């Protein structure tokens, strides 16, 4: 269990960013690692087999906006990025989850197109294949996996921001609606901790949110927990050693550098570190320290 870092890839502040930086909760340190080959915001990160993957996003730059179909793999042992097979379609403001060593890419946008499509990556074969689409088009969608079921939470369908959520049952290749959240949220941070899917922050169509609610997959209810100290949309999120970490985002005024940590035992959030610069739209995952 020792030696794991929280990696943050990409993001946005004025333009899309190429940063890869890793935070060590055991000593408070940050390391700057190899830049992404292409700057991107609105991407997702995940880890399979100790490799970090950056999935989708968009390169917002002075000279244009390019939605990304890219899958890139970072090996901490070499501090190098390598291209992997690209997805079927560009997906900005994507959500990603891992089931049994396979990466699911969910939703996202391509220009004015809001995807319901979903595809699955097989690392051993370096291949993507489309699976059943969601019941709803969703960009800015939060995704997490619990008990080998994939959840897609909130987002924006092209007309409305969503409180709805749905679950993918892989053995049936089928999506079904679940209980909707109490709050409309696009660009929330979504993760799994114990037996619940958490949705933290986001944007409800009027304000960036500090509220946090969790879906108990047994009782099918959403319950609010303690709110974050900061309102934030387009935050990064991950779980590490039984606690939720939220990174950056936008509070309606500032691109935040603050990282908060949720302790479920005490139902409290505390500020644990700051990123080296404020940013939103990062991808986040946990794996072993590099080199
Ligand atoms: C106001 C605002 C907030 C974001 O979180 C953004 C993220 C992006 F990737 C690009 C633009 C953005 N603008």
Swiss-Prot record:
Entry annotated with the keyword Glycosyltransferase: no
Keyword terms of this UniProt record: Cytoplasm, Kelch repeat, Nucleus, Repeat, S-nitrosylation, Thioether bond, Ubl conjugation, Ubl conjugation pathway
This protein's domain notes: The Kelch repeats mediate interaction with NFE2L2/NRF2, BPTF and PGAM5.
Principal cellular location given in the protein's record: cytoplasm
Organism: Mus musculus (Mouse)
Chain's role: Substrate-specific adapter of a BCR (BTB-CUL3-RBX1) E3 ubiquitin ligase complex that regulates the response to oxidative stress by targeting NFE2L2/NRF2 for ubiquitination. KEAP1 acts as a key sensor of oxidative and electrophilic stress: in normal conditions, the BCR(KEAP1) complex mediates ubiquitination and degradation of NFE2L2/NRF2, a transcription factor regulating expression of many cytoprotective genes.
Superkingdom of the organism of origin: Eukaryota
Consequence recorded when altering residue 12 to A: Impaired interaction with SQSTM1/p62
Sites annotated Sensor for electrophilic agents: 112
GO molecular function: disordered domain specific binding; identical protein binding; RNA polymerase II-specific DNA-binding transcription factor binding; transcription regulator inhibitor activity; ubiquitin-like ligase-substrate adaptor activity
A Gene Ontology BP annotation from the UniProt entry: proteasome-mediated ubiquitin-dependent protein catabolic process
Effect of residue 58 to A: Impaired interaction with SQSTM1/p62. Abolished interaction with SQSTM1/p62
Mutagenesis or variant effect for residue 161 to M: Impaired interaction with NFE2L2/NRF2
Posttranslational mods: Non-enzymatic covalent modifications of reactive cysteines by electrophile metabolites inactivate the BCR(KEAP1) complex. Accumulation of fumarate promotes the formation of cysteine S-succination (S-(2-succinyl)cysteine), leading to inactivate the BCR(KEAP1) complex and promote NFE2L2/NRF2 nuclear accumulation and activation. Nitric oxide-dependent 8-Nitro-cGMP formation promotes cysteine guanylation (S-cGMP-cysteine), leading to NFE2L2/NRF2 nuclear accumulation and activation.
Kelch repeat ranges, renumbered to this chain: 5-50, 51-101, 102-148, 149-195, 197-242, 243-289
KO phenotype (gene knockout): Early postnatal lethality caused by abnormal cornification. Mice survive until weaning and probably die from malnutrition resulting from hyperkeratosis in the esophagus and forestomach that cause gastric obstruction. Defects are caused by constitutive activation Nfe2l2/Nrf2, leading to constitutive expression of phase 2 detoxifying enzymes. Mice lacking both Nfe2l2/Nrf2 and Keap1 reverse the hyperkeratosis phenotype and are healthy and viable in normal conditions.
Protein name: Kelch-like ECH-associated protein 1
Keyword Magnesium assigned: no
Family to which the UniProt record says this protein belongs: Belongs to the KEAP1 family.
Quaternary structure (record): Component of the BCR(KEAP1) E3 ubiquitin ligase complex, at least composed of 2 molecules of CUL3, 2 molecules of KEAP1, and RBX1. Interacts with NFE2L2/NRF2; the interaction is direct. Forms a ternary complex with NFE2L2/NRF2 and PGAM5. Interacts with (phosphorylated) SQSTM1/p62; the interaction is direct and inactivates the BCR(KEAP1) complex by sequestering it in inclusion bodies, promoting its degradation. Interacts with NFE2L1. Interacts with BPTF and PTMA. Interacts with MAP1LC3B. Interacts indirectly with ENC1. Interacts with SESN1 and SESN2. Interacts with HSP90AA1 and HSP90AB1.
Localisation: Cytoplasm; Nucleus
Phenotype for residue 93 to A: Impaired interaction with SQSTM1/p62. Abolished interaction with SQSTM1/p62
Included range, full protein: 323 to 613 of 624
């Amino acid at each position: 269990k020792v030696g794991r870092l929280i990696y943050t890839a990409g993001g946005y502040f004025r333009q899309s960013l190429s940063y890869l930086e890793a935070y060590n909760p055991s000593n408070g340190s940050w390391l700057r690692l190899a830049d992404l080959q292409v700057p991107r915001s609105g991407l997702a990160g995940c880890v399979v087999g100790g490799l970090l993957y950056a999935v989708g996003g968009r390169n917002n730059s002075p000279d244009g906006n390019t939605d990304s179909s890219a899958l890139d793999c970072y090996n901490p042992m070499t501090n190098q990025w390598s291209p992997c097979a690209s997805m079927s379609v560009p997906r900005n403001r994507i959500g990603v989850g891992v089931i049994d060593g396979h990466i699911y890419a969910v939703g996202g946008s391509h220009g004015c197109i809001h995807h319901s499509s979903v595809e699955r990556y097989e690392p051993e074969r370096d291949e993507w294949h489309l699976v059943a689409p969601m019941l709803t088009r969703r960009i800015g969608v939060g995704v997490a996996v619990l008990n080998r079921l994939l959840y897609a939470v909130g987002g924006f369908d092209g007309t409305n921001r969503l409180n709805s959520a749905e679950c993918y049952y892989p053995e049936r290749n089928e999506w079904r609606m679940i209980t909707p959240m109490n709050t409309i949220r696009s660009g929330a941070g979504v993760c799994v901790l114990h037996n619940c899917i958490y949705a933290a922050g986001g944007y409800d169509g009027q304000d960036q949110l500090n509220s946090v609610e969790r879906y108990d997959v047994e009782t099918e209810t959403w319950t609010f927990v303690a709110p974050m100290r900061h309102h934030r949309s387009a935050l990064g999120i991950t779980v590490h050693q039984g606690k939720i970490y939220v990174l950056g985002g936008y509070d309606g005024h500032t691109f935040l550098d603050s990282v908060e940590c949720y302790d479920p035992d005490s139902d409290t959030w505390s500020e644990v570190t700051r990123m080296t610069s404020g940013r939103s739209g990062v991808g986040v995952a946990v794996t072993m320290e590099p080199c």
